[PDB]
Ligand binder design. Structure first.
Ligand SMILES: [Zn+2]
Lengths: 287, 54, 63, 191, 286, 420
């Protein structure tokens, strides 16, 4: 009878594999298996994550083929992947990320070997593209109902675990079903390779190609955007002619939610492209 | 011209975008089209017909 | 890039979109009912002609 | 039982269809591969057997696996091109021994040589020094000949064969109309 | 045949995994991975990929080790779980193109269709684009050399469709979006000269070295087009472009009037509230 | 409240309220007992041995680990240390109790000795790659290496940092290399400046925690540039909430100048800079009577985030100590601090933790003992700064708050003429 404060390490491998698996996350139930290595009690690291073929039955213990699982795991053992399985993941579209009776039964059956048995449910269907916040699930012991529910130390990270604060699922089904915190990790090779890879993904090939395109489109296409920009500017100035009357009458309180200032600041920012690219044309013409 | 309003058979209405493959030929209004559950993209249209016309 | 499609109507009065798919079809492609369909993929897998209005189907069932 | 890997190198030159010897003995040594793979299967079915030729552009026909059901099919379509290649024929398997699944399987590589060797004695002592260095069991089987059978290959084997106690054996077959199966099955390597 | 390709960062992060699962052995050779993609459409789209144990020899370069059963099993199971993607080609992490790559690529030319080749760098120190699509096609040469496999550079782009943009953006939390305006423009206008300076300066030095110290024909025929296009801009006297400088400078004047006038409009609320707020708060404070 | 007075009679009421759960709560209970009584050469070891002198096999080893950690709390900076016996007791092989608690107790008892023996056994104690015994090994190595400045130790720790994946080893060696740096103002410029650009955020916090005690006394106006520059510029909130602790540790001299420059950080962008800034107001105005933080405590105590509420109650608890009501109107923070234990039903589980934990600060020692950041001559106390920084290190590991008793400086007078 002892418990610690565990935290699931999530690298970009399992993340991107759950993003491609979320793209393949059809309404039909899907299956997946997580791998890794157990170094101590209160830490768990995932490295290898793959997908499983779909079945008409869906998420179930019968769909997990032991000769296929052990066959692929053996083919990972003959390669440079000497990691044992650490858990299984799946997708729950529509009805929420909670776990049904079948999922908790195959979780109870799959947790006999690994005491941790990390469970992750990805649901990118109804989640907006602004946040990719994912949560890992855990199974509590049925004999711990007499004593405290979760005797987990280091209660600081629970404030970060309070971000999924839906008022129906977390404490709507929190009995006999709790969760765990999630952190990330990134080395310098992922930082510089993925950082320079994304900057290059927003940059050009030689980085000098599409500059003169806009530098010379300022004279052909942007002129229409400058004339229309002046049409919006005058289209606001026609009301700014009426503003000094109200400002000359009341001077107390603000009733119009429009600021008429920051939009024109943005118009000036779009208009400064001519100034910033004029020096570019000066460099291209010079040398 | 790029994004228009669609009317589903079930009753609720939505708005969709334009796919990079198709053009504005069949995109004109008055032509029944098809949509996708993910991203509400447009694969192709749906030509109308009738029962005795079959 | 050949044109081939079909119009589907579920029992719950919901219309979806899908092309003509499945196995080798000989007596299929007719406007009938009782076809094979999965949970949400809505594909055609097993088509078999169906009755209903049993008042005419079971007119005189004699072996 | 015996845990070891088996690698065979067969010749695909046109020197294997001459009418003086057996009638296209390629099938005969194919049956030799069949009886040694089925014999090792009867001894220990967990042994993996690879298949590769000695042509200029060496191609792995079958990965090391105990399932010979598809190896029987892969023994066909020999593509009779090229004459002989020795250096990358040794290096294509002796260096590929590290890709096996079972690390406990000992290293054993045989080869069917049906063409005269093009490498000089310097390459024979460098490759023999490499194979004796890495300590791999090497069985040399020479089918057919034009010049004398073993003139420099004798010193090639004597300098290549280390661990005189229960070490490797040399297979030298003389001319004769009899089959090669019983003649190569005489040493202890078969069985 | 193919004009451009699309490579997702998932395969390059799988090369990060190639550099992760090494195990500190001391080899770090050009590990060859089996590239996967969609060859159906004219444009190539890489979704994911996997690897195969690949080992070469120290001295002899012609040694190469591949696997057919592992390729048919990983490709068979991957096709069983996802049949929308099939084999297309391969890629190596080595920075130098060796001679054995014709034999390594020849296997996937025989068994698989025309394979595309991608050369990347083991260390992400290169500022340029790490991915270069090299099509494996045989071209006829004018000098009379026998027909051989030629690797022509196909342009490539690094883009993500739906989710990898969100995952990368959440994992970084340091990179910025387009953000048109002052900073995103002036950073490009500052570092662009180094972005061309490291490329040109890095290339013309070994180029000039191979001019005098070069043999084994390097296709000197294309050098005539090189210096030709370089001499297609013979220091124009700018006589005709003066009126174009009057047009672009007149647009500059338009930006001057827009900035001065619009900012003069912005000065209204500031230069009014500064008085009416201070004098009323002061006269009503006590 | 029972520190120094050795009043175990409150814990003698019943045994079902302490040993009812087998977890770290009993370790913190025995460590708290070590905070209760201190300065005993016979009643300490005898009192720890009298608890179960029957079979010499306790079912819960947290009593033994808390006996070693509590003994280290008792014999802190004493001249009659039992370290010689603690080496033969540390030689015994046990599961993480003598390692963690024995390392903390032995390192605290051997603080400032700079002995190479505790360095060797400490290194062979951290050579097991474990994060807990390496965390306690770092906490003990920083204490024992006070002023030693060994050549191979810094490079061995920073070299031992990036070769492991655990985080408690990185924070333990972070405080380990942080506390070792004292008086190296003219030395650690290139070390901290070089280690500031490290890719590891934990070590990035270790550079600021390390430069905190190095620049005490407001002797360097340069480190604040990169302290606030990494507090605002960096995207990770670890160095952002761990940044301004060095700012308070170097600017502890003037209590008035702090709220003028941290008032912007009171209500910052993210709640992490609000919490770390709450620690900054807690450490900079402690023991003083400056109301420039007290008038700013009212906006800190009301916010949907429980972090700024917890650090707001702690910062409010560090100022109200040693203060009379007739001088300043403290009724607001007394009443709002008293309403948290009755309002705990509708509050968070950690908000009541920091609430009653903040209420234990004023009642500490029965208003007799207090804390002080500097001595009477103006010099600052080393165990006071160590005790307050480790006291602020309770976020990652809560049982580390037991080192607050090292900063308790009772305020009184002495008119002792003769020794007897
Ligand atoms: Zn479901």
């Amino acid at each position: 009878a002892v418990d610690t404060a565990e935290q699931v390490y999530i690298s970009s491998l399992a993340l991107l594999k759950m993003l491609k698996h979320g793209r393949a996350g059809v309404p039909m139930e899907v299956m997946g298996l997580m791998l890794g290595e157990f170094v101590d009690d209160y830490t768990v690291r995932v490295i290898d994550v793959f997908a499983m073929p779909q079945s008409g039955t869906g998420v179930s213990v019968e769909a997990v083929d032991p000769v296929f699982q052990a066959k692929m795991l053996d083919m990972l053992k003959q390669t440079g992947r000497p990691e044992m399985v650490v858990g299984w993941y799946h997708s729950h579209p529509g009805f929420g990320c909670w776990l049904s009776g079948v999922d908790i039964n195959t979780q109870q059956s799959f947790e006999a070997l690994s005491e941790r048995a990390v469970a992750v449910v990805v649901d990118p269907i109804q989640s907006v593209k602004g946040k990719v916040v994912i949560d890992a699930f855990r199974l509590i012991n049925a004999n711990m109902m007499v004593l405290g529910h979760e005797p987990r130390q280091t209660t600081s990270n629970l404030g970060h675990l309070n971000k999924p604060s839906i008022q129906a699922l977390i404490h709507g089904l929190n009995r006999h079903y709790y969760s765990i915190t999630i952190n990330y990790r990134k080395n310098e090779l992922e930082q510089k390779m993925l950082l320079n890879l994304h900057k290059k993904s927003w940059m050009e090939g030689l980085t000098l190609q599409d500059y003169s395109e806009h530098c010379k489109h300022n004279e052909s296409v942007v002129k229409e955007m400058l004339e229309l920009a002046k049409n919006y500017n005058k289209a606001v100035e026609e009301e700014d002619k009426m503003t000094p009357e109200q400002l000359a009458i009341k001077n107390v309180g603000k009733q119009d939610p429009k600021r008429h200032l920051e939009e024109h600041v943005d118009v000036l920012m779009t208009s400064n492209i001519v100034q910033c690219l004029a020096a570019m044309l000066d460099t291209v013409v010079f040398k | 011209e790029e994004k228009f309003i669609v009317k589903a058979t079930n009753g609720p209405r939505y708005v969709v975008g334009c796919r990079r493959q198709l053009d504005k030929s069949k995109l004109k209004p008055g032509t029944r089209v098809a949509l996708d559950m993910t991203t509400l993209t447009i694969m192709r249209y749906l030509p109308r017909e009738v029962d005795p016309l079959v | 890039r050949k044109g081939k499609c079909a119009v589907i109507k579920t029992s719950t009065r919901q219309t979806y979109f899908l092309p003509v798919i499945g196995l080798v079809d000989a007596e299929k492609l007719k406007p009938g009912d009782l076809v094979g369909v999965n949970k949400d993929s809505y594909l055609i897998l097993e088509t078999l002609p169906t009755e209903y209005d049993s008042r005419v189907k079971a007119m005189e069932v004699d072996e | 039982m015996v845990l070891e890997s088996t690698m065979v190198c067969v010749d695909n030159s046109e020197y294997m269809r001459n009418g003086d010897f057996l009638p296209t003995r390629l099938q005969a040594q194919q049956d030799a591969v069949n009886i040694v793979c089925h014999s090792k299967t009867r001894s220990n079915p967990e042994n993996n057997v690879g298949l590769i030729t000695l042509a200029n552009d060496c191609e792995v026909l079958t990965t090391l696996t105990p399932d010979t059901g598809r190896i029987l099919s892969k023994l066909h379509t020999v593509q009779p091109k090229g004459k002989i290649t020795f250096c990358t024929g040794i290096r294509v398997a002796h260096l590929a021994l590290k890709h096996r699944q079972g690390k406990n399987h000992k290293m054993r590589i045989i080869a069917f040589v049906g063409s005269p060797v093009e490498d000089n004695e310097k390459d024979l002592v460098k490759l023999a020094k490499r194979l004796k260095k890495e300590k791999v069991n090497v069985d040399i089987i020479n089918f057919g000949e034009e010049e004398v059978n073993t003139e420099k290959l004798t010193a090639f084997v004597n300098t290549l064969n280390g661990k005189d106690g229960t070490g490797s054996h040399l297979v030298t077959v003389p001319p004769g109309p009899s089959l090669a199966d019983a003649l190569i099955s005489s040493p202890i390597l078969a069985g | 045949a193919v004009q451009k390709v699309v490579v997702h960062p998932l395969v390059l992060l799988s090369v990060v995994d190639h550099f992760n699962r090494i195990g500190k052995v001391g080899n770090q050779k050009r590990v060859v991975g089996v590239l996967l993609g969609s060859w159906q459409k004219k444009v190539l789209d890489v979704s994911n990929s996997f690897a195969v144990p690949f080992d070469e020899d120290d001295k002899d370069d012609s040694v190469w080790f591949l696997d057919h059963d592992y390729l048919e099993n990983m490709y068979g199971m991957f096709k069983k779980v996802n049949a929308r993607e099939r084999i297309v080609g391969w890629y190596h992490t080595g920075p130098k193109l060796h001679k054995n790559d014709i034999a390594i690529n020849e296997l996937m030319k025989r068994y698989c269709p025309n394979s595309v080749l991608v050369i990347i760098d083991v260390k992400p120190k290169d500022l340029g684009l790490p991915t270069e699509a090299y099509i494996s096609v045989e071209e006829v040469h004018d000098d009379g050399t026998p027909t051989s496999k030629t690797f022509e550079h196909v342009t490539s782009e690094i883009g993500a469709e739906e989710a990898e943009e969100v995952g990368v953006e959440h994992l970084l939390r340091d990179i910025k979006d387009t953000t048109v305006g002052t900073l995103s423009q002036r950073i490009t206008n500052q570092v662009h000269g180094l972005k061309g300076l490291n490329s040109k300066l890095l290339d013309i030095r070994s180029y000039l070295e191979k001019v005098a110290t070069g043999k084994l024909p390097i296709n000197h025929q294309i050098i005539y087009q090189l210096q030709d296009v370089f001499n297609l801009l013979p220091d124009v006297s700018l006589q005709e472009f003066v009126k174009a400088f009057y047009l672009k400078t007149n647009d500059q004047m338009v930006v001057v009037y827009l900035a001065s006038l619009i900012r003069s409009v912005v000065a209204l609320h500031n230069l009014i509230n500064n008085k009416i707020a201070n004098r009323d708060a002061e006269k009503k404070e006590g | 409240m029972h520190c120094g007075t050795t009043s175990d009679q409150f814990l003698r009421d019943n045994l079902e309220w302490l040993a009812r759960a087998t977890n770290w709560a009993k370790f913190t209970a025995t460590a708290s007992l070590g905070v209760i009584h201190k300065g005993h050469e016979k009643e300490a070891l005898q009192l720890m041995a009298t608890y179960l002198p029957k079979d010499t096999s306790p079912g819960s080893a947290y009593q033994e680990g808390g006996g070693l950690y509590a003994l280290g709390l008792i014999h802190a900076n004493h001249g009659g240390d039992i370290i010689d016996y603690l080496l033969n007791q540390l030689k015994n092989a046990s599961n993480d109790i003598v390692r963690h608690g024995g390392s903390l107790g032995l390192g605290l008892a051997a603080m400032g000795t700079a002995r190479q023996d505790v360095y060797d056994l400490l290194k062979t104690n951290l050579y097991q790659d474990d994060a807990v015994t390496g965390e306690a090994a770092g906490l003990a190595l920083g204490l024992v290496m006070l002023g030693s400045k060994n050549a191979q130790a810094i490079e061995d720790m920073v070299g031992y940092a990036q070769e492991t994946q655990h985080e408690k080893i990185l924070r333990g060696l972070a405080v380990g290399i942080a506390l070792v740096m004292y008086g190296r103002m003219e030395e650690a410029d290139a070390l901290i400046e070089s280690l500031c650009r490290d890719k590891d955020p934990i070590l990035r916090r270790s550079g600021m925690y390390t430069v905190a005690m190095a620049y005490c006394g407001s002797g360097n106006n340069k480190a604040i540039r990169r302290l606030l520059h990494v507090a605002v510029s960096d995207v990770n909130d670890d160095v952002r909430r761990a940044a301004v602790e060095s700012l308070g540790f170097i600017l502890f001299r003037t209590p008035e100048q702090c709220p003028s420059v941290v008032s912007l950080l009171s209500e910052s962008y993210n709640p992490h800079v609000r919490y770390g800034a709450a620690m900054a107001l807690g450490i900079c105005c402690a023991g003083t009577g400056n109301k420039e933080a007290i008038n700013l405590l009212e906006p800190m105590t009301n916010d949907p985030v429980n972090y700024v509420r917890q650090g707001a109650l702690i910062a409010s608890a560090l100022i109200m100590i040693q203060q009379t009501e007739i001088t300043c109107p403290k009724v607001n923070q007394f009443r709002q601090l008293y309403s948290k234990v009755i309002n705990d039903k509708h509050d968070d589980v950690m908000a009541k933790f920091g609430a009653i934990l903040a209420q234990g600060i004023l009642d500490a020692g029965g208003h007799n003992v207090t804390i002080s950041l500097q001595s009477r001559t103006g010099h600052t106390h080393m165990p006071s700064v160590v005790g307050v920084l480790v006291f602020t290190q309770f976020w990652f590991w809560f049982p580390l708050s037991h080192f607050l008793s090292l900063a308790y400086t009772p305020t009184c007078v002495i008119g002792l003429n003769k020794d007897l």
